[PDB]
Amino acid sequence: MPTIKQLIRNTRQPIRNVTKSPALRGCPQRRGTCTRVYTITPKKPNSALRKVARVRLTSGFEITAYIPGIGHNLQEHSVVLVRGGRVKDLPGVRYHIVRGTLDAVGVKDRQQGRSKYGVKKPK
Amino acid sequence: MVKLRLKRCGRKQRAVYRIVAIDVRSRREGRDLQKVGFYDPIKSQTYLNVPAILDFLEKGAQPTETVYDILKRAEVFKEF
Amino acid sequence: AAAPTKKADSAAKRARQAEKRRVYNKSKKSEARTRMKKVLEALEGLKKKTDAQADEIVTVEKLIGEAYSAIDKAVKVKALHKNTGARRKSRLARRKKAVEIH
Amino acid sequence: MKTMQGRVVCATSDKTVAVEVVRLAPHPKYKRRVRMKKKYQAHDPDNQFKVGDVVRLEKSRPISKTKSFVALPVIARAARKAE
RNA sequence: UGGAGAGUUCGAUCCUGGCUCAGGAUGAACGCUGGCGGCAUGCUUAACACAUGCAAGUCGGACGGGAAGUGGUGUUUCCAGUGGCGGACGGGUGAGUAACGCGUAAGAACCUGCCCUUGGGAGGGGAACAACAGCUGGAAACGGCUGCUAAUACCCCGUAGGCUGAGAAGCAAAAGGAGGAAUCCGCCCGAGGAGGGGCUCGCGUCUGAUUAGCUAGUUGGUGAGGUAAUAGCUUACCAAGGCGAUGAUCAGUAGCUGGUCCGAGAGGAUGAUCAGCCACACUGGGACUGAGACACGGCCCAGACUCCUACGGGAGGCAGCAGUGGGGAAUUUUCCGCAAUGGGCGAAAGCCUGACGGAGCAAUGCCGCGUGGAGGCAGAAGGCCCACGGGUCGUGAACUUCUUUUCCCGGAGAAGAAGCAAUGACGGUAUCCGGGGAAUAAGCAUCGGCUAACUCUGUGCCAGCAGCCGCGGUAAGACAGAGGAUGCAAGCGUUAUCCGGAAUGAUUGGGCGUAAAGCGUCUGUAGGUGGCUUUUUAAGUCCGCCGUCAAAUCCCAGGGCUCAACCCUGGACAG
């Protein structure tokens, strides 16, 4: 342990803290309009065609976001809503998309996870 | 000035009613400098501390309507 | 709907009454400051300038007698009160005996 | 009223003496003694107390905004550095 | 009565070490779903700009009156006006402020409406003035002349303990009004009490020193000036100091605290709701009135906006309640009432009171209940698996008897009202009795390992999954669907955020030969520590006691709403 007399001179205290995903002033979700909807390749162990879109937030920042599930309907003028979660396979992508909200539609014919992916109840 | 009455602590249907020693320029349910005693409406619980009363009334304290009646319901304030 | 007769809640009413309470208190305070400055000019120049033969009243203590009566008449009203009205008398009574010939 | 002892460091001021009070007090979170030193501007209308004298300070009527303490007694003589 | 971890850096092992997950919590949002009740809570993002209504008025037992309404044949009562008191209470916001703002402990140089204890006095006069009336300038706002008039409007005179002063002496106050064969209230001065509000001092009060210098009334001293009061608060002069590494100044950020969340504790992160304190309220500045606010719903000036105009000139500002626009992931009825408690006024009645008491919207959270109970096959259809000899979903269902809270319908009906022609918003209230009938009421996540729970198809590094290690290139329990199972529950899941896990800043709790780590080596100031004996001091320390540590949280024991949440007594604790 650092000696008791050096603990009065220096006094150990943490930092200003860095955030994992800057979604402003402690806000859970953030709204924004999609600028460019493109397709990008993953890292070294994976090889697929993942759909990523650059979302222009309400603050003025343009960060990338991942689209979950099979099939979507996001255009160049679509008003989407982000979540805030890393994928760790695609570099730069720190956000996720909440489907079933605003302009983002839910996944068709999905029977499993209806709370996430934004799917309604089939009768 | 200072006066005697009762405040509110118990909300909704259950109005318990608090103790007293507060100024007129303050709140309905705020700061109280000294404690005394209270009464519960739908119960047989009637306190009202007698050595605290008459000791506070001698130095410019005004006895208002609500502290009265519950004063004469007990053995205090009579021709004795 | 509106009323058949005319009405307007005068906010200038509380201002006019405040100006009426001011004009009385200002005229009595400005009097107590102008009369005091007339006395301070007699204590400054050391006025032993005698001209009256009937009454040998000295001009340095004559205006101080008018100053005493000018301070206590302001203690009646809401302009000047206690402790302050005693302080205005204590400082004027200190310099009349200090700046005087023995 | 409160009484605190200390040594005079500066005397080059008109009717005012700079008294440095040393106070030893243990830390509530830790255990050891942490020394704090604050200088008080005491009143001395008789200009008797010079630099190096250890005097006790009592609370009184404020003669200024920084000055509120007066030096009434004296426990020991000059305990300063040699010239 | 309090302290469980595991996965992953290797061929592997043991260390070191970062990352990740299991937990709780959050005035939360989103996605799916959605039966109620009790209690609490609800722009945390623009202190942004605001339609409308309301949020402070009350007294004629202070007056000149009487424009309404009700009697009588002039009294209740009362529109305006003078005057008294309150608009500096309450409500809201936290922008600003790390600062003598706040918290804790002391101090002296104070003021202080209404209330209260004591003593004395309350005599005798004067000149006006709104309202009103006759004219009159203007679109309006706002007014401009002349005349009349009352009072607890005002101003003298007389008297005077107090005040000034060493003393002698000098000098200043007034209101009267009501019921009654003289009571009640109020008025003026002084000396106290109480309560409130200023002022002084010390400690603790964020981060960055790749901000180390800062400071002229700046620090202090004499004299006048000034404040309720001490004082550089102020002016002139004299001295020239004053602050700083136990870190000033500067920059960024921020209301403080009681407490709240987590944690075994310590500690860490915060301080929404409730309560104390401070500050602000269109922005900047200033003063007046008054005991007190230099004052949200007051005034004046300037500025940016909005609105009116006969453009000459004027009126406003919700960080009060409810609402609008806008921003935002997101946060509600432009409701009812004075009945109850409280505030303002009044000798009362009573009036005013979106303070508040209630209701409404919202599963936002906590708590309780309910959506059926027993019985029922040799395990029926119909699905999933199948070695097809079966098994499973399954008592699950159907089929049978039974009870029916809550929801629904009908009839009663406690208490919160003390006051006291018997006075309630809430209320078709709580709760109770009866009548139909299960009749109206469940889902969500997950199932490779940590993580509690399995296979068969389809797809097939394709599409997609993912907190981490990682899964998918034909039979992958980690993709997609189905059957089944697990967990939880009207909640579930996801995300955000703090704490825990991190003895990974360790004060309680860690380390520096090689894993990150002794500065290359000395001298040395401040600072930290310091042999042995006796006496003394006793400051630290320790014991006991007296204050304060607000209340409410938390904890212990005990009560009341059918339980609980919640509410509540005393104690404990406030280190």
Structurally, chain A folds into a number of domains equal to 1
Q: Is-contact D13 D39, C-beta < 8 A?
A: no
Give the residues across from A38 on adjacent strands. A52
CA neighbours closer than 13 Å in the CB half-sphere of residue B62: 8
Alpha carbon separation from B31 to A44, B5, B28, B41, C69 (Å, rounded): 68, 13, 9, 23, 47
Which CATH number goes with the domain that contains A77? 2.40.50.140
Q: Which residues pair with D25 in a beta bridge?
A: D34
d(CA C40, CA C30): 15
- Cα atoms in the 13 Å half-sphere on the side-chain side of A119: 18
C-alpha dist (Å) from residue C83 to C70, C72, C74, C78: 16, 12, 13, 14
Phi, psi of A81 (to 5 degrees): -130, 125
Method: cryo-EM
Q: Do A4 and D34 touch (CB under 8 A)?
A: no
Instruction: Tell me how far apart the alpha carbons of residues C50 and C56 are, in angstroms, rounded to a whole number.
Output: 8
Closest residue by Cα to the C1' atom of nucleotide E506?
A: A1
d(CA C62, CA C49): 11
Burial class (CB in 10 A: 0-12, 13-18, 19+), B17: middle
Chains near C (3 or more Cβ pairs under 8 Å): none
Asked if residue A32 lies in contact with residue A57, where contact means CB atoms within 8 angstroms, the answer is yes
Q: Give dist(CA D23, CA D37) in Å, integer.
A: 7
CA distance, residue D34 to nearest chain A CA (Å) = 8
Burial label, C35 (beta-carbon count in 10 A; 0-12, 13-18, 19+): middle
β-pair partners for A33: A56, A79
CA distance B44 to A26: 52
Task: Show the domains of chain B with their CATH numbers.
Answer: 1-80 (3.30.1320.10)
Whether the CB-CB separation of A96 and A90 falls below 8 Å is answered with: no
| Contact call for residues C65 and C59 (beta carbons, < 8 A) | no
What whole-number distance in Å separates Cα of residue B77 and Cα of residue B67?
12
A113 is in which domain, residue-wise?
A: 2-123
Q: Among A109, A56, A54, A102, which Cα is nearest to A81's?
A: A102
Q: Parallel, antiparallel, or unpaired: how do β-strands D16-26 and D33-43 relate?
A: antiparallel
**Residue C19: is it exposed, middle or buried by C-beta count within 10 angstroms (0-12/13-18/19+)?**
exposed
Is A5 in Cβ contact with D30 (below 8 Å)? no
Q: Which residue has the tokens 């200190």?
A: C94
The structure was resolved to a resolution in Å of 9.4
